[PDB]
Amino acid sequence: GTVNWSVEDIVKGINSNNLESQLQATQAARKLLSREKQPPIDNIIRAGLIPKFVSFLGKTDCSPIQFESAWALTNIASGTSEQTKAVVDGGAIPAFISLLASPHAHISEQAVWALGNIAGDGSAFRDLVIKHGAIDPLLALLAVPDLSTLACGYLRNLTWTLSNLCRNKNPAPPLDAVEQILPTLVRLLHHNDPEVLADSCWAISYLTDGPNERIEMVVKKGVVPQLVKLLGATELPIVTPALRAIGNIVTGTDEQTQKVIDAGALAVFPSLLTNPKTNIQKEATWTMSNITAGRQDQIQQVVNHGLVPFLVGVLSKADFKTQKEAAWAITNYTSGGTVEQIVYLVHCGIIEPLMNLLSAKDTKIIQVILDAISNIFQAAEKLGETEKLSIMIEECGGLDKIEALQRHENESVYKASLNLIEKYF
Template identity: 25%
Template sequence: MKNSQKLGGIKKLQQNSNHEDLVQQEQLCQELKDEIIQILRMDADHITVMDSINALRSEDFIESHKAIIKLRRTLANFEQEIAKENELIPILFHIIQYGSTYLLKLEAACCLYFQYYLEIISILAGGRSEITRIIMENGILQLSMSVLDGNQSELIMLIITILGKLAGESVKYRDSILQACSMDKIISKIESKYKSIYIWCLANLCIGRPSPKFDKIQSAFEIFAQVIMEEFNQQNLKMINDAIWALGYMIDGEPNRIAALINSGVVPQLINLLPMGNFVSILRIFECIFYGTEDQIKYLLECGFIAHIRMIVDPKSRDKSGDMIQTFAATETLFKVLSNQNFLVSLFRSLSDDNQNLRGDALEVIGNAIQQGTNEDVGRLVGNGLIQYLLSMLEIANEKEIASIHLKKGLEILIKIIRKGEIKAKDNKSNQFFIIFVKLDGVSVIQKLLSYKQDDVAKYALLFKQEFDI
């Protein structure tokens, strides 16, 4: 299709705008504004896509704009399959390219008219992959930069919506957008009334694998942290969940990104949001932390992670956890986190920690895992050193203060582990878990507890001795 066919009347308008007769130009501007105001006050009648394409190709400037406004109203009110996007989209972009600079001089009325073009593109951007490809190929990034350089908030909001949809379509489009439009430029345009749309767009620009280079998205990281720290309510629920969702992709298990997350101060808030926010996305953030350094993992545990997980996995508290683990994705993510080797080792190390509350929560989580788990589950815990860590806690009881309730809980867990080993063995000598216990000098540890200063602990040690005949 030739440009003259695409442009129609808009080309003539462009030529007139360059005429030296300024008086005639001002008169034309006024006439156009009057016409557009009348168009916008029309009844909301509808038009087919094919009829709108024909009107846009015509030499009649006003009729082409009537068509585009009717089309916008048609798309807004009816869910329909758009069969001619490959023809419509290039025409829309061509008219915008040659006419937008001049039309924006016509102030509010024409800005509203120009908004209709962007609204149609925004609607189409949420369609099939083929449509998004056509939109990307017809200059949306150049148009976006032009609009973002302006100060028309409604037009900027529509561009942000379009960019968010395109970024969510593919990593390729996401990276192209990040190459053309900096995060700082988008963030600088955030308005409170459209904040949730901006956060959603920024989130789409940060998700996907491979993750974008951190220097390109770091400024959005800080925005997400601020959103998460806001007071939680139903009005900002989606916005907070979008921010959480994005952070889960952004930290990506790299220690420097995890350090940025911790330094932002959001980890305690994320733990508090477990019962209310996006449970799966929060768990994925914590899973990433478990691939960080030992200090980073310990920080997460000290912020109360184990206490909240204890509530979720404890059958007695399951009713308090609401619907958090009622979906397959949530259950799968939870068990993926709980079976992470780094998490297990950190959990077991907590048994000898000076923090009594942390130790108590760790014992409850481990106890429930042993009670509810299969032989295979218990075998995985033992394989990660659980028996050794339990014996270490029991052994240091003579050197530093360990609450008697924790010592009894440790003995109780140890008894249950060895009992699990007996399911496939008829005597202690062939019990794989008992063999590990003996090799780790567990017998001498129990012998010492028989004379422990607190009688209730000594009684538990005696029960252990009698049951397993040591």
């Protein structure tokens, strides 16, 4: 019936003075735009069909053509920024927001979906969707006593669109919009659908990616314990954004960091720091590095949880990117730690894998490591066990690598390495 029409045929039908002919052509357009293999989005745009689709959104008397055009427009907006813009330029934003109040759930859902694509394009369209007043009717769709009564697909789409309203960073979403969305977000974070949980976590990770005032808005909502729980989920699509959120949070103040420690996050890290997915190991190690950048009592918690052997482990063997984060974690630790904490690090076997990494062709990690060596020697000086440390480094081949780094391209590398030898070797 409406399968595989030409764009010419679609135009002919949409241009007829006949609502049913228009409906059939619009459905034909939706099927064209729904195919996986290279939908002719630009041809549809160039035919001038977007204003027609947008006007069909307003035809309350013909709910089928509202749905078909919403779907068609959704899929145009799912494309490039230029394609999303064409949709916005056709006046689609206020028309979709009006459709959020549709009596027909499949139509309001499609409107939710379309707005998600538009907002997902970037900060500007996100903020434009917010200015046209989308947040109130979106949240109203979720104002039910029990989220479980909503259709599953419907709830997932709403959650996904809300997360796009939270997404992107220059600038971040308006503070008032974030304040408005957060309580619904907190509630979605306690829902039992894995996709809803994933997208809720993504939203939270977006909101916590910024200055500490942004982090505080989220932390004040009391979500950290729920995030830590989700950190232990079996589903990788949930663990990943939960961990990003937790990692974001510990980039904050010592007090914000202490919240994730208090919530029991550290007991999950034996698994996270040995996780089969390299991205999880990397994010977990980055998170650890920011925890070792905290107070001495926070470093002590890392110790108590037995995580220093796991850091030695990752420094010893991991994807290089993960190893670099471990290097940071160690340099941070040795920077803020007590002498006893630093001694403990050495007794856990940090020196050999630390030295092994000095042969990396990455000048940044070298500077990081040399700094760590320095810090450990400073602690060893306060103990007068500098001799013992120098030997340890020599016995595992460290002195060789440090000797070589004296003739290094980078200024501060050459400097730091010579300084070490001229003071300890």
